[PDB]
Each structure stands twice: as structure tokens, then as C-alpha cells.
Amino acid sequence: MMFKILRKERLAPGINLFEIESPRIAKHAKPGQFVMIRLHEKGERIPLTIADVDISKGSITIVAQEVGKTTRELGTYEAGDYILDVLGPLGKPSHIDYFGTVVMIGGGVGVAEIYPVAKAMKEKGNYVISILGFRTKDLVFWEDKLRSVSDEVIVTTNDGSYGMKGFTTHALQKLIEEGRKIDLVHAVGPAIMMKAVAELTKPYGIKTVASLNPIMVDGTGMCGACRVTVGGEVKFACVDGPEFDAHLVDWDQLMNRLAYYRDLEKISLEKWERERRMV
């Protein structure tokens, strides 16, 4: 009928973890895959990554950052509330082989998204360096969790309030300039961050994979809402990805397409806030 919320955890301001009862998805989910959710009958469908699974509990875990109407409304949900629709696991699993040294880069909520991939890379015998990017100290989360599946962790804050000062890319550029051996870079975060990572590694010829985050509706290949240009060819991220070779992605097109509904997104958020002012 619907999907029970087993547990909710506030990981940082605006970053909410939900453990959801879904034995089918837990049984089949692999690192890198995602779900579409819809909260209620008037809601929209949105994609969220499967950040963890617990087969013994028949559960999956998603971590949703509050960025607009649907994720703000989701952030109010409690354990024992229900998510009306959860479709998964979607997308192609991350490709896990022995590469050598893998640098996993998570920006913001991308830190939750990279955890299952980092864990799978480590289990395959890779040397794993995880770069975690946050805006400021109070947004830092899952440092210990990522350390548990990494050989090295580098935490960055834009303002230097915790860890290394600067962007994810500053930490990565430091590793490159030190001459560290790097066989693969995986980036998950805001499109602006993934573009910046791709542009930094391209001159060095370092293989770089990004998990793309375009607009999605059905998430099953029916519509092309999620389309991207990769190596000059149109691909649908929900079925052909969402991971692609970052050096072949048209980043400016992806960012253009992600901005298209900005005015309507604002109208919807403003309506929700306006209608809950009285108390």
C-alpha cells in the first residue's frame, strides 16, 4: 500500500536520513542505484540515492537534503509515517573492479551517496581516499562512517571552520601535485562540483566518473526528462547511468536543464511556507 518509515535521523541541519521498509528493494539494491519517491497523492516524484541497505531488516536508507518544497516537506516526516510510493532499485550499479587507488569525492549530501560505493571499492581491494566537501562545520556528517570504509579521509569546509579549508577540488589538486598515485576519481555532489572535478582531472588524464543528477519523472526510461549529452550522444541518465565518464559529459547543458523550473519551484515552496504561517 505504502512504505513505512522505520527510522529518521537528523544528520546535520537540513540533511535528513530515512530508513524505509522495502524488502524487495533491499534484496536487489546495489551501490550507485537510486529510488523515485512520492510522498502523497498531490506530490511529485523525486530521485534519491540508496545510501545504505539492511537486508536483515528488509530496509533501505535514503538521505535527503532540504532544498525545495518536496525535500522540505519530507524533512517533517517522522518514523511511522509513510512514503506513498518508493520505486527501486533504479539505474545501473556503479562499476566496481580493482582499479588501484580510488579517490571518492562527495559534496554535501553526496557524502551519503558515496558511502555504498566507497564500501564496495574497499571490499574489492582498492586503496580508497575519500574527500568530503561541506560548506561549513555544522554541515559535516558521516566522517566516521566514511572513515570506516576508507584508507584516508580528507574533510574540507569552504570556510575553513573544520578540516582543510577550501573545496573538494583543492584537496584533489593537492593530491595530484604531491604525485599521489590515482587510478580513478568518482564524484557525487552538486553539478557545479562534479563539473569542477572533471575539469581539474581532464588535463592529467585521470579516469573520472560522475553520478549525474538531472531532472527525473518516471525514472524508468519512458520520457527523456533526464537526458544528457555524453560523448556527443543523447543518453537517459535514469537507465543508461546515472554514472558516466565525467570527461564526456556536457556539463553546461546539464546545469542549464537543471535550472529550467526555478521560478515554478520557488512558487511551490512559497505556497507551502505561506500556508503554514499561522500557528
Partner: protein, 463 residues
């Protein structure tokens, strides 16, 4: 015989009213009008009536019409007997009477259409089903069927909840099977729910079929993408047979330069946002949709007409840009006329060369190639036409992602599942039908395939 050559018209809402909403345009017959139209039928013998041969499932059209005429003074009995006859061959008459391209089927074959207007068979079938639904007469006939069910203890899985899968499931349930339908989207109905808009197929008609399936004891599991959520091998282990009704739900997108500019939608995305997500009610509903002042719809089938008329209801000036001639359009003639009435503009013998953007990556114009007539070929002449939005509606095809994951399943080069004379696939015990075996086709063919596959499954499991 003497022929009454003019059809009894069905009332329709005014253009000015109906372009302000997504409500049904054609209001259908009343009892008095339906009986008058039925009286025009010449009652050709069933063994040769050309309308019957033109109906893809060969409904006894003169028979159900006669049931109306013989009960002029008892509309409830008339409709009950007519619907009983129709249901011998068709599970979905409220839908097919609305959406069949009858001019290519029953009505195009009707004798009266050679000298005048053919019998309005679709609207009579629709009337029978609608009147029955409004008065509980269909429920009476369904309960009569349910009384006759003898459970047989065997389980069948249906993949996909479009007309093929819904129809197969109902027939299998009537035969005593325990049926589960698995559906990837959050609501069943397939194209009936996300593709065809409410202004010609009201959602209550589809919801009625889901209520019937509930009463028949069919289980429906939404949010199950077979191949991902549950594997095909897991279904084969759990079920005695499987029917694949997964449709042709991938958009055909030609590699035009600029096709990823903002404001360009596939028809599937545009229509799913409108119909399934109710984006025309934004922000009451949360899914947005954006149309500019001028919309181009590329194509000439029902999908194109539905996208164009939806965009017009969102306030745009709308153009159909079609690569062939008017006579070659494949949309239902009735809906092409409705689109003309509602103000859709039409341009023929044109096809896009490229889409042109502005600095922000938004669509600004389309460079069009002129065509001449046998396939159309470009004349070499091109011109640029300004547009804010474009909707691509040049056809759909099956999802090869799903199909390649099904172990042992033979599929042709167009993505159609290969089946034998019993609709059985290359995997024994796995059957398929509808758009999954035909490519894009019709609702009535998907319904017919679901019934044929249910009979084949019964034969296979009974032997």
C-alpha cells in the same frame, strides 16, 4: 432497404468552455439519441456484416444494436443485454468506443457509410458501457461472472498494467487463477492513465476497471519495475505462467542538433506530467510544467494531437508540424477535427533540421526542411520559425533495457517480443501481447491480445 443517411449527432461542449479545462469534450448519447441512431442500422446478417469484420475482435455489432431496439421501453434491460453481447468479445467498451479509430475499423466498413454517415458504432458501444456504469448494470453482469469462478490453485503473474495486462488478468481470474499484476508506475492503466488525456478518456473509466479487478480478486502491485525490483527468474520460480504486457513506452528521438535545449519535451514526458502528475493543476499538485507562448508539436498521430491540445489548454498558441500530408496523419479523425476546432494550427510537409537556442540554453526557434512527395523527401528549401516550446511526438518503441535482462526471451530488431500462434514467447509458460508484441498499435488490439493470451495460458496449464 431504405437508408437514413445522416447520423444522429452526439452533443459536445463548446470550444470556449472546454479549452479552459481537461474535462471530456464529447458528452455522448442519451438513451433517446442512442435508440434513434440504433434504428439506422440495417441489421446485416452476423455471418457477413462488414462492421463485424472491421472490428479487430469481431464484436456482434448488429446484435448489440438489436438488443437496444428490441427493448425500446426498458433502457436498463436494453443496456444489460447489449453489454452482455459486447462483453463476449470486448472487456473495455467504454474505452474503445471512445478511442478506436473507427474510420479504419468497424465504421469504415459499415454499408451506410458508403452513401452517407456510417452507423455511429463507437458512440453506441460507449453509450451502452457508460449507461451500464452509471446504473450499476455492469456490476450486475460482473457479479454474475464472479459467482461462476472456481478457484484452481494456480498463480499467474502479469507484467504491466495497461489494457493488455488488465484484460488478461480479468479473464484469468474468471477462469479461477490467482493473478498478480506488477506495474512499474505508481498507478495502473498504462497509456490509459499517463498518455491519453482526460478530455477524451476520463480517469473514472479506467478506475472502474481497477474496481472490477478488485472484485475479481486480482492483486495489483505498483512501484514494481520487473527486472529491477523483482527479477524475471524470481517470477518464474513463484508463478505457474507469466504474461508480458509491457507496451512500447520509450520515445523515438531523432538526433536533431539542439534537441536537449530547454523547452523541448518528449510527448511521453509532457503527457505524463499533465495526465499522471496533474501538472495542469500546479501548484495545487507539486509537479510543474512549462509552456511558452508558442508551442511546436512534431508529428501527426494521436500522441501529437493529445500533446497539442494539452498545450493549448495551458495557454499557448500551438502548431502541429508534420512531415507528410494531412491525408496521411494517423490520429483519430474525430480528434484532428477537435484540435482544429480548438485552434491548433497545422503545417504539413515539414520536418526539423535543428533546434535553435538562446544564451541561457532555452529554445528560441526551429529550422525546418520543406518536403515533397511513396516517402517524403526534402526539397532543399529551409526556413526558421520561432518557438518557445517543442514536443516530440514521432512515435514510441519498446524498452530494450527491460527486454535484454529477461533470460531466454527472443525479441526482434524493433524490440517486439517474438510469439507463436498461442502468443507464447521463446520461454515456455511465458506469453506476451499488446504493444509489446506489435509495437505501437491500438487499445482494442491490446485488449484482444490479453484475452487470447489468457485462453492460451489456460490451455497450457490445463494440459
Amino acid at each position: 432497404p431504405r437508408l437514413i443517411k445522416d447520423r444522429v449527432p452526439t452533443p459536445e461542449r463548446s470550444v470556449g468552455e472546454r479549452v479552459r479545462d481537461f474535462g471530456e469534450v464529447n458528452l455522448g448519447y442519451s438513451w433517446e439519441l442512442a435508440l434513434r441512431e440504433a434504428e439506422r442500422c440495417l441489421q446485416c446478417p452476423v455471418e457477413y456484416a462488414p462492421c463485424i469484420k472491421g472490428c479487430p475482435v469481431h464484436i456482434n455489432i448488429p446484435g448489440f444494436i438489436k438488443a437496444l431496439r428490441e427493448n425500446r421501453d426498458n433502457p436498463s434491460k436494453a443496456v444489460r443485454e447489449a453489454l452482455r453481447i459486447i462483453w463476449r468479445d470486448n472487456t473495455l467498451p467504454a474505452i474503445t468506443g471512445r478511442v478506436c479509430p473507427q474510420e479504419e475499423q468497424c465504421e469504415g466498413a459499415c454499408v451506410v457509410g458508403k452513401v452517407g454517415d456510417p452507423i455511429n458504432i463507437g458512440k453506441l458501444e460507449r453509450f451502452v458501457a457508460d449507461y451500464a456504469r452509471e446504473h450499476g448494470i455492469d456490476d450486475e453482469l460482473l457479479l454474475e461472472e464472479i459467482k461462476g469462478i472456481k478457484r484452481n490453485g494456480k498463480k499467474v503473474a502479469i507484467i504491466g498494467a495497461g489494457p493488455a495486462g488488465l484484460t488478461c488478468a480479468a479473464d484469468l481470474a474468471k477462469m479461477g487463477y490467482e493473478v498478480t499484476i506488477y506495474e512499474a508506475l505508481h498507478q495502473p492503466g498504462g497509456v490509459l492513465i499517463y498518455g491519453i488525456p482526460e478530455f477524451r478518456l476520463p480517469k473514472e473509466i479506467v478506475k472502474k476497471e481497477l474496481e472490477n479487478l478488485r472484485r475479481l480478486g486480482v492483486k495489483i502491485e505498483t512501484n514494481v519495475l520487473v527486472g529491477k525490483t523483482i527479477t524475471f527468474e524470481e517470477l518464474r520460480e513463484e508463478y505457474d505462467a507469466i504474461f508480458i504486457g509491457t507496451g512500447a513506452g520509450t520515445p523515438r528521438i531523432y538526433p536533431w542538433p539542439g534537441v536537449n535545449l530547454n523547452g523541448i519535451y518528449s510527448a511521453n514526458e509532457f503527457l505524463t506530467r499533465i495526465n499522471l502528475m496533474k501538472a495542469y493543476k500546479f501548484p495545487e499538485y507539486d509537479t510543474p510544467i512549462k509552456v511558452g507562448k508558442r508551442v511546436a508539436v512534431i508529428g501527426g498521430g494521436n500522441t501529437a494531437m493529445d500533446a497539442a491540445r494539452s498545450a493549448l489548454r495551458l495557454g499557448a498558441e500551438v502548431w502541429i508540424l508534420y512531415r507528410r500530408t494531412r491525408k496521411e496523419m494517423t490520429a483519430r479523425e474525430e480528434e484532428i477535427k477537435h484540435a482544429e476546432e480548438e485552434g491548433v494550427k497545422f503545417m504539413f510537409l515539414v520536418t526539423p533540421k535543428r533546434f535553435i537556442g538562446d544564451e541561457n540554453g532555452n529554445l528560441k526557434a526551429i529550422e525546418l526542411e520543406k518536403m515533397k512527395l511513396r516517402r517524403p523527401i526534402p526539397t532543399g528549401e529551409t526556413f526558421i520559425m520561432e518557438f518557445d516550446t517543442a514536443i516530440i511526438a514521432i512515435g514510441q518503441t519498446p524498452n530494450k533495457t527491460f527486454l535484454e535482462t529477461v533470460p531466454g526471451l527472443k525479441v526482434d530488431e524493433w524490440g517486439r517480443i517474438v510469439v507463436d500462434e498461442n502468443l507464447m514467447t521463446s520461454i515456455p509458460g511465458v506469453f506476451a501481447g499488446g504493444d509489446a508484441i506489435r509495437g505501437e498499435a491500438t487499445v482494442i488490439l491490446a485488449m484482444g491480445d490479453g484475452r487470447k493470451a489468457a485462453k492460451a495460458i489456460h490451455q497450457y496449464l490445463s494440459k
